[PDB]
Paper text:
Vibrio spp. are highly motile bacteria responsible for various human diseases, the polar flagella of which are exclusively driven by sodium-dependent stator units (PomAB). The flagellar stator unit uses the transmembrane ion motive force (IMF) to generate mechanical torque to rotate the flagellum, which is employed by many bacteria to direct their locomotion in liquid environment or on viscous surfaces to a favorable niche. PomAB assembles the characteristic bell shape of the stator unit family, with conserved 5:2 subunit stoichiometry and overall architecture. Five PomA molecules arrange pseudo-symmetrically around two PomB, with each PomA subunit comprising four transmembrane helices (TM1-TM4) folded into two radial layers.
The high-resolution PomAB structure was determined in a detergent micelle environment, raising the possibility that detergent molecules could have an impact on the conformation of PomAB, particularly the membrane-facing helices, including the disordered TM1 from two PomA subunits. To clarify this and to better mimic the native environment of the stator unit, we reconstituted VaPomAB into membrane scaffold protein 1D1 (MSP1D1) nanodiscs, as well as full length, non-cleaved VaPomAB into saposin nanodiscs, with E. coli polar lipids, and determined the map resolution, at 3.9 Å and 6.3 Å, respectively. In both cases, we were able to trace all the secondary structure elements of the PomAB complex, except the two PomA TM1 helices. Comparison of the PomAB LMNG structure to the MSP1D1 lipid-reconstituted structure did not reveal major conformational differences (root-mean-square deviation of 0.642 Å, 1,312 Cα atoms aligned) that could arise from detergent artifacts. This indicates that the flexibility of those two TM1 helices in the inactive stator unit is probably intrinsic, which might be functionally important during stator unit activation.
Numbering used by the authors:
A (entry chain F), C (entry chain G): 11 to 61
B (entry chain A): 3 to 252
D (entry chain E), E (entry chain B): 20 to 252
F (entry chain D): 1 to 243
G (entry chain C): 1 to 251
Write the structure that this text describes.
């Protein structure tokens, strides 16, 4: 069988998921500026083939 | 099987206690499970043809719906034909009632009239055949379990790029991102609670069937030798103290 | 050979990293709402058995 | 834990259900309920009873051999016996059975015990392998539930509790409960092999009529190799 | 990459360059250009063609078995064979050489094909191992670019697009092309080895002046090893 | 080890330490509770696989692999052919006047000169080689277990610290430092796993391999000494076995 | 230099131009603390397992592999057969009148003409081949260890950066650049592992294979010359060894 990937990559992924949970928390008690979210939304559409 | 009833109970309890916070629609999506399952079948089919995959599926079906013959009922039957041969020779074996295909094949080869070498070769070939069949089914489901999470993350990435193509509202990113992650969740669940468990149960059924088949060929070899059932009792129950059934005894 | 983690673990960490950094980007232009913070904190102390 | 806060801050029916129930489901999909109970029984016996000291077995083998030589082949039924396997050896020797049959019985008992210990090690290493996978699955479920319900704090809370505590439970059960129990069973299996080997060889020497002076020297040939070599120079 | 609505979403020259070119660089550092090109040729042959079915192989071998049984080693020239390995074997048979030298040559050829397929599998497994790693390089580069220019919206889009598409391409190439191609090469290796073992056994059985039907039995013995017998019910 | 190797090790440690210094205060990255959690939990878990005697033996065998270097093979061949020449021009009594370079070779020649058969001496050296090999394997196992469990203990500590942080928020501006302190446990677990325990385990496995080769050479040399064979053949045979 | 290393250099230049264009500038992909962490930790870990002398030997063999192209085997065979003709029609003394570009073959030729017997010549050439193989294997091991440890050190440094960013996190809406700096250490670990150390180890493996093949051809030729075999027979022997010594992927 293939040797697989080292344990540090698993630790890194567990840490990444913990940071997802806590950044979801910070965005949970927050009020996104609607004005500043559509220039970036237009930029992602432009850079993704839609526009 | 009682294990199947426990499986149903665990499925129901897990679903009920997962979907309690909100509605079942957040964790239920036919598109995500279809993506994961279809991609995994396609990937495995590049390394298994349709016939060998349907064979693995049917052996899994046999391993789940049906139950392997117990290696104690087997003892009853073997000593029964041992008594039958001791009272009336091999001519008493055919009229008996047998519900196991392997002993039936063995005795149907025995009645015709054959020495130990040819019947032993045929029986060992059949045992190796069934062992390999179960082994390839375990390989198929190990491949399924290995590729299911990868397909789920590919589906998640596709869903994420589809989500990044559909913006303008702060409130759709959360539900959209959740639907995208649903594919990875399904990939993980199928890997860990279906495909790897199915492969493990296939290996378990392989071990049970291989043990039963060694028991049967040894029983048929002893009957052909014409040995009395006494020493036969010990030389066949001693095989019952290997595997996991010797763990369950106290 | 001693085993390791499956080969998809790198893609999983990749996905975790991408999503985390998408949330830091979303969190970059989001203002905190203190009332929602108090409500989420109360629900948090309720969900951990701390009353 | 106690310095951070209380045990009450790690309690959730959903997280405990996910990790433990999923692990039990996965293990029962490849193991029988009765065999798993037998593995639990053998783990409990390994944890509630220390293995007999090899030195005590060699010395006690010598005392029964002395007693047998003073009072014939039936002189070992008047004083206490420690464990059941040697008791079975004694009650087979008291029957005047030949060497081959008692040897077969002892080798069947050693093999059965070895199989039980290896299978218990396999069950608990399977448990320890599946628990962190269920913790990661619980993190994914909690993340999905959080992202689906970012407008509802009453749902944000429990979802993160599930996500965090599933990982915590998977890690704790895998590395501090299940794998340690499997390691203790492997150690206990090695101890069983050493004690059983010493006792069957002792019974063989008593049956052969060998004088105990050579028997003790022969049994001492076993204790000087094993896992305890990190203490020896 | 179709569930998004079309293909035009899933296309960036930057991500394709970083992923494919990095993987190509790593593989050419691991393998020579000749090995890589040979691996591409063998993968193309395995996918666009099909190895000769063993059933037809046994039928043809017993055909020449009967032909040799009626006319000794001289009839084999006058019938057509569509398979290269059996034709080389029969040529080494008719050119007046002993069993030892032809057996050595066929063993060398089987090992050569096995080693060629094994190296092609290794090349594509290296590709499938490196592709997600390149996806990881691209994710970090795109995420660094995104977090650095948060105040520049026209730079936010492309950086996140490259970061995401690099990962999508790495995952798709690793798990749906390169690892599947390596697995198909392994499947063709096992099938090809079985077919060549059938042919070498047939050639040795034709030299041995022996009945075609027992030859047929030895070859039918080979049809129940591998994934084919799993299909067999 | 060599002074250059120790200087390089100290230089690398110094580089890591300064790079830690330039990213802010170093007391920001220091927490006694986190290091106690990681170290105490790792010791507690490892003690369920190894007794205190086994743990101390592994510590000693790892310590003596950092202050003593495996003898270079050519010196062993040179020395064994030196006592080959000594035996040819003298006798078995000439080896006692030869001073101490390796403990394994010394005990072998001592068991050789006191009057024992070739087979029993071979058996004694075989048990000693096997004993040293298994000692190195158990030490590698101990340190592999430490390196496998240290990230696990770091993750348990980060989750426990984070649960403690979520149990009482009371302040939004205090969330970040609390998560930094909680992640410190993961940082220490990762550092101990990937910079201390796995490197010593890998080094001890490597030292196991060279030591097995070296001890095989010494045993073959002393067995050749008991044969009373030609020393040139010994040199050729040992050099062939090297390659 | 082969095509692979040129492709790597141009790909790295394209990677740098891509990074600078994506990020506008280049100074944010450069962080002294991140480079210091990755390099110092990798050297630290590798020096727990190899000596400083071993590290220099690995570096030197890698430099020699990336600076001097290995001789093509056909040119060596042509050289062995031409000096073989010269010695057949001019004796051993004719071998000091033509130039030699190979130090190992030159050592073998001087050792051959200085009257040493076949036994000592074979022993010395085998010792040289074993020393080169051991040097290459040790270098491959060192660079494999660097590739194994560099991403672990990168993840350690990213943990350091995350602790720094969250510890200094008040009202998180300026944490973007700090998070990027934290990720830079893992980016460095990934680039060093996937694009430098593992490629160097693999090229060292390829050079080990080439040098073993080349050295086996030259030792066989020199020993054939020592016994004075006919140039055509030894020419045939070398051709058979090269075609069988070639892999199956390129035949």
């Amino acid at each position: 069988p293939p040797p697989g990937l080292p344990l540090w990559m698993g630790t890194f992924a567990d840490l990444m998921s913990l940071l997802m949970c806590f950044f979801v928390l910070l965005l949970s008690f927050s009020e996104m500026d609607v004005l500043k979210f559509k220039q970036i939304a237009g930029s992602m559409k432009f850079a993704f083939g839609v526009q | 099987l009682a294990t199947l009833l426990g499986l149903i109970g665990g499925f129901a309890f897990v679903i009920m206690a997962m979907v309690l916070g909100g509605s079942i629609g957040m964790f239920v999506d036919v598109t995500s499970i279809l993506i994961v399952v279809g991609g995994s079948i396609f990937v495995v089919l590049m390394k298994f043809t349709m016939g060998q995959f349907f064979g693995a599926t049917k052996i899994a079906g046999k391993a789940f719906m049906f139950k392997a013959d117990e290696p104690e009922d087997l003892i009853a039957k073997i000593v029964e034909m041992a008594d039958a041969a001791r009272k009336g020779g091999f001519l008493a074996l055919e009229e008996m009632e047998i519900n196991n295909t392997f002993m039936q094949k063995g005795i149907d080869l025995l009645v015709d009239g054959h020495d130990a070498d040819v019947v032993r070769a045929a029986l060992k070939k059949d045992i190796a055949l069934t062992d390999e069949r179960h082994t390839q089914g375990t390989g198929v489901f190990r491949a399924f379990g290995d590729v299911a999470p990868a397909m789920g993350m590919i589906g998640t990435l596709v869903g994420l790029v589809a989500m990044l193509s559909n913006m303008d509202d702060p409130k759709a990113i959360g539900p959209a991102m959740a639907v995208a992650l649903l594919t990875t969740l399904y990939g993980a669940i199928l890997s860990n609670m279906v495909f790897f468990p199915i492969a493990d149960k296939l290996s378990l059924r392989r071990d049970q069937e291989t043990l039963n088949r060694r028991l049967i060929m040894d029983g048929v070899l002893a009957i052909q030798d014409g040995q009395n059932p006494r020493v036969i009792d010990s030389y066949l129950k001693n095989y019952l103290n290997e595997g996991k059934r010797a763990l369950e005894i106290d």
